[PDB]
């Protein structure tokens, strides 16, 4: 027969185990619960609703004197498995979730040992509220957090702690998220830079409350920006070059304003797509959003300047006066600065004089139109030489500032500890 049945019966039914009572010999004592996290897969991070979905394993560990047995008396049984509904478990819950999933997804068996040690490792899928810092999108890094608290007991009855490992006979706390190389999958968009674990005690709260303590696991994950650079930033940059390129179009063809407005519309479409991809928070304007606003403002300036050039090109000496100052500053000084490229017989004689006068007036009109055309061309050249470097410098500066948004070397300010798995705190 199986001795496990006899042992389980003796532990639960014969000893009258109560799963609603804390496992202490006196009521004034405390129960130490060791908590640990094992991230197996970072499923997603939806910025639109500020949700971090993660597949984790929750490692609980506590002593229970009611589950102790003499191993040699029960035919050398060194371990047991019991369902959670038969034994007392600490109800550690995720406080900062977005849905009603406070507990773990699956209630797997607990493992008990003859010394009373109980280890419970259920899997879970948690959707915590991660506030999205969209300031340096898409080169951003997010400081997400998972907050676990024991709301079923106060700090005088249950004390949460971090699980302790042993190396070389010395105990050190596990102050990080455990990543098992044989059960972890890279997300492909988020890279785990830091993963600290902290035990927080709030001194302004009382020990007899359920808000006095909590254990928090942080995920400082940076976004790999290759996808967004290839698919969003590159077409935005390429299309925006056509805006400054619209100045090179001659005013004769009616495709100047068409090109500039089309560039503006493409930038607006990209802006709307970016707004669809990002949350509606008002903490800060995104980096790509600021870039798009800057580009749209500059393209609007280009459209206004193209309208001015078109107005100057189609001016007529019968409707406007070519002033001396405008002439001397738009075809003498500025083009040189910018290095631009450079009786029947009596009736017949009276008729000939009249037609010669008409041809003279037509030629003077043509010369005035040519002067206005040169004025338009030099305004186009000046606007190109004053707008194209502004576009290039703005794009380069914005993308360099975004690219230099490295997450900090230490996870907490003022704390010299790096919270790395390769450097134990007290070992």
């Amino acid at each position: 027969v199986n001795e496990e049945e006899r042992l389980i019966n003796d532990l639960l039914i014969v000893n009258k185990y109560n799963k609603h009572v804390r496992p202490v010999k006196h009521n004034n004592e405390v129960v130490n619960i060791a908590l640990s996290l094992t991230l197996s897969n970072l499923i997603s991070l939806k910025e639109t609703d500020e949700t971090l979905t993660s597949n984790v394993w929750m490692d609980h560990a506590w002593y229970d004197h009611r589950l102790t047995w003499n191993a040699s008396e029960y035919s050398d049984i060194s371990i047991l498995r019991l369902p959670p509904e038969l034994v007392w478990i600490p109800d550690i819950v995720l406080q900062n979730n977005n849905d009603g999933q406070y507990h773990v997804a699956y209630f797997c068996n607990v493992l008990v040992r003859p010394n009373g040690y109980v280890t419970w490792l259920p899997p879970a899928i948690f959707r915590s509220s991660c506030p999205i810092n969209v300031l340096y999108f898409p080169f951003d890094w997010q400081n997400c957090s998972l907050k676990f608290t024991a709301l079923n007991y106060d700090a005088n009855e249950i004390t949460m702690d971090l699980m302790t490992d042993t190396i070389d006979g010395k105990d050190y706390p596990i102050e990080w998220i455990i990543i098992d190389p044989e059960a972890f999958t890279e997300n492909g968009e988020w890279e785990i830079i830091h993963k600290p674990a902290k035990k927080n005690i709030y001194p302004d709260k009382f020990p007899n409350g359920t808000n006095y303590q909590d254990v928090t696991f942080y995920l400082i994950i940076r976004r790999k920006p290759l996808f967004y650079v290839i698919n969003f930033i590159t077409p935005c940059v390429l299309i925006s070059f056509l805006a400054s390129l619209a100045f090179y179009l001659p005013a004769e063809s009616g495709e100047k304003m068409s090109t500039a407005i089309s560039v503006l519309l493409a930038q607006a479409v990209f802006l709307l797509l970016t707004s669809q991809r990002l949350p509606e928070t008002a903490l800060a304007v995104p980096l790509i959003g600021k870039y798009l606003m800057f580009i749209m403002s500059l393209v609007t300036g280009v459209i206004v300047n193209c309208g001015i050039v078109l107005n100057f090109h189609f001016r007529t000496p019968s409707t406007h006066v070519l002033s001396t100052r405008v002439k001397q500053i738009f075809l003498e000084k500025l083009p040189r600065i910018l290095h631009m490229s450079r009786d029947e017989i009596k009736s017949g004689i009276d008729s000939t004089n009249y037609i010669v006068k008409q041809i003279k007036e037509k030629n003077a009109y043509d010369e005035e139109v040519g002067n206005w055309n040169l004025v338009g061309q030099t305004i186009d050249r000046l606007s190109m030489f004053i707008i194209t470097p502004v576009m290039v410098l703005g794009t380069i500066f914005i993308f360099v500032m975004g690219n230099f948004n490295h997450p900090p070397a230490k996870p907490f300010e003022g704390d010299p500890f790096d919270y790395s798995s390769d450097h134990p705190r007290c070992a």
Binding site: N18, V24, N27, E157, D204, M257, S275, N311, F314, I355
Partner: protein, 406 residues
């Protein structure tokens, strides 16, 4: 065994969680209701539903749950599963979905005097009537109605929760700074709490919590307002292009298309409530109508520009009103074979003279067009500036009241 087990066995020997803790018949159980907000998740305007993560600070007195701590090794208090004790059915009567009860079902805290305090946590999706008049530069007055679903005033008496010391009653939503994550879109201006009684039925009594939250409109300003301001600037610009260049209509209708696209893509943000029109939608409609009128007037200007003596005759009143009076105001004022050869040259001169007169009248038509579009430019600039300034001034003046009415 542990005396906690003995005390639990003694307390729940004949306890029935289906019975009110009225020690005498006719008594009312005074239930204190408070709320602790930990996170205001989102305010979904499309379905008019606000979801929050809250703690329900409940407290009552059960005479059956009394014991002497001196006879049980100094046990001043116990933590009992919430299903084992009687609880009032304090549910969210304002819930949009079918989520009345709490979610977490934490343990209750029973003290030796009989005082029971229960603080369950829940994600509550309540329904909020959205005042959409000043969207998005607006504030919402969203309520959460908490009362016992079953027990009326003759059986329970709702009150307000006590503070940490317990010497006074707190009449507001308690916010714990160590656990509150401030929402990135809403700022809590006022969080009062009050008890409401309805006339014609004394059996009704509830405790409601108000969240007078003001939206931060930076997102909508950046992604909707500034692009439309740029589009309206373009619309004003279309009365500065020459009619000779064939890009006036392209600019005007491209501006109209942009405004239409922004209005259509805003439909997933504005709620479908039909009580009023949001001020951003009013601004978009104002810009759309202005751009449509700019298209119509650009069509009129182009029609005036291409006229000729062969098609139209200049009216007396049009000339008198557009060449004489307006340009002073608008500063647009303008500044044998010899016999056959002689006959041919005279015919050439006659044709040139006729062409000269024809283009003189054509230039008069073009000048009338130029004066017309300059007048339209000034009028549209003034109208657009005044309308935009007035709309945004009214939007900015919308602030929540200095004191809530609770």
């Amino acid at each position: 065994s542990v005396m906690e087990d003995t005390l639990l066995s003694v307390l729940f020997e004949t306890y029935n969680p289906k019975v009110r803790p009225a020690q005498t018949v006719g008594d009312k159980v005074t239930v204190r209701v408070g709320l602790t907000l930990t996170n205001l998740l989102i305010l979904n305007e499309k379905i008019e539903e606000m979801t929050t993560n809250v703690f329900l600070n409940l407290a009552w007195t059960d005479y059956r749950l009394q014991w002497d701590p001196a006879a049980y090794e100094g046990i001043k208090d116990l933590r009992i599963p919430s299903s084992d004790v009687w609880q009032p059915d304090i549910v969210l009567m304002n819930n949009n979905d079918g989520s009345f009860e709490i979610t977490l079902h934490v343990n209750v805290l029973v003290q030796h005097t009989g005082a029971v305090s229960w603080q369950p946590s829940a994600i509550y999706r309540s329904s909020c009537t959205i005042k959409v008049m000043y969207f998005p530069f607006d504030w919402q007055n969203c309520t959460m109605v908490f009362k016992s679903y079953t027990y009326d005033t003759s059986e329970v008496t709702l009150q307000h929760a006590l503070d940490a010391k317990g010497e006074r009653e707190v009449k507001e939503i308690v916010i714990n700074k160590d656990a509150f994550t401030e929402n990135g879109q809403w700022s809590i201006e006022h969080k009062p709490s009050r008890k409401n009684w309805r006339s014609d039925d004394p059996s009704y009594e509830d405790v409601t919590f108000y969240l007078i939250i003001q939206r931060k409109p930076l997102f909508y300003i950046v992604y909707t307002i500034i692009p439309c301001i740029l589009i309206s600037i373009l619309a004003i610009l279309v009365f500065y292009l020459p009619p000779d260049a064939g890009e006036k209509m392209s600019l005007s209708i491209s501006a109209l298309l942009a405004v239409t696209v922004f209005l259509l893509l805003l439909a997933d943000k504005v709620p479908e409530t039909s009580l009023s029109v949001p001020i951003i939608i009013r601004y978009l409609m104002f810009i759309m109508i202005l751009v449509a009128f700019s298209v119509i007037l650009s069509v009129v200007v182009l029609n005036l520009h291409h006229r000729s003596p062969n098609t139209h005759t200049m009216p007396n009143w049009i000339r008198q009103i557009f060449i004489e009076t307006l340009p002073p105001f608008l500063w647009i004022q303008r500044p044998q074979d010899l016999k056959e050869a002689v006959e041919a040259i005279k015919y050439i001169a006659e044709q040139l003279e006729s062409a000269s007169e024809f283009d003189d009248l054509k230039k008069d038509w073009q000048y009338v067009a130029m004066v017309a579009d300059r007048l339209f430019l000034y009028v549209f600039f003034v109208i657009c500036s005044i309308g935009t300034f007035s709309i945004f001034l009214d939007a900015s003046h919308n602030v929540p009241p200095d004191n809530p009415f609770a």
